[PDB]
Ligand binder design. Structure first.
Ligand SMILES: Cc1cn([C@H]2C[C@H](OP(=O)(O)O)[C@@H](COP(=O)(O)O)O2)c(=O)[nH]c1=O
Length: 129
């Protein structure tokens, strides 16, 4: 697995972001996470979190997993990093997303995310409150 450079184009919601990747604009769906739909409880919160984390980043990186790189809707499936920090992981650690959708052999960071979820649950953060 390797991180690749990308440019923030526009926020979409908690687990989806529009990024310029290799000179082409595309929507990226964050791997292994499920944020509330924007409405569901904490949906706006999750959206604001991702939007802020991504926009404040000096450097945005995309990291594809070992399996399929795009879903049926043409969205890139990856782990997004903002200044070295994984957005997927931070959302789950903040209790603003649950671990979900383990598909197409893309589960490299599943355990790391499961640990963040357990901690957020233990702390009764947001979704787990
Ligand atoms: C995270 C992820 C979602 N998806 C699909 C499953 C869902 O399809 P359906 O439309 O059948 O529900 C959809 C959920 O995306 P959102 O959570 O953005 O709605 O994206 C994948 O196929 N692979 C993945 O790795």
């Amino acid at each position: 697995l390797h991180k690749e450079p990308a440019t923030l184009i526009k926020a979409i919601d908690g687990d989806t972001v529009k990024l310029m990747y290799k000179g082409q604009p595309m929507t990226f769906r964050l791997l292994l996470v499920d944020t509330p739909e924007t409405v569901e409880k904490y949906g706006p919160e999750a959206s604001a979190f991702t939007k802020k984390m991504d926009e404040n980043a000096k450097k945005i990186e995309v990291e594809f997993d070992k399996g399929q790189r795009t879903d049926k809707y043409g969205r890139g499936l990856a782990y997004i990093y903002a200044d070295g920090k994984m957005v997927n992981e931070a959302l789950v650690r903040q209790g603003l997303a649950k671990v979900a959708y383990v598909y197409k052999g893309n589960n490299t960071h599943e355990q790391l995310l499961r640990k963040a979820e357990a901690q957020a649950k233990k702390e009764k953060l947001n979704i787990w409150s």
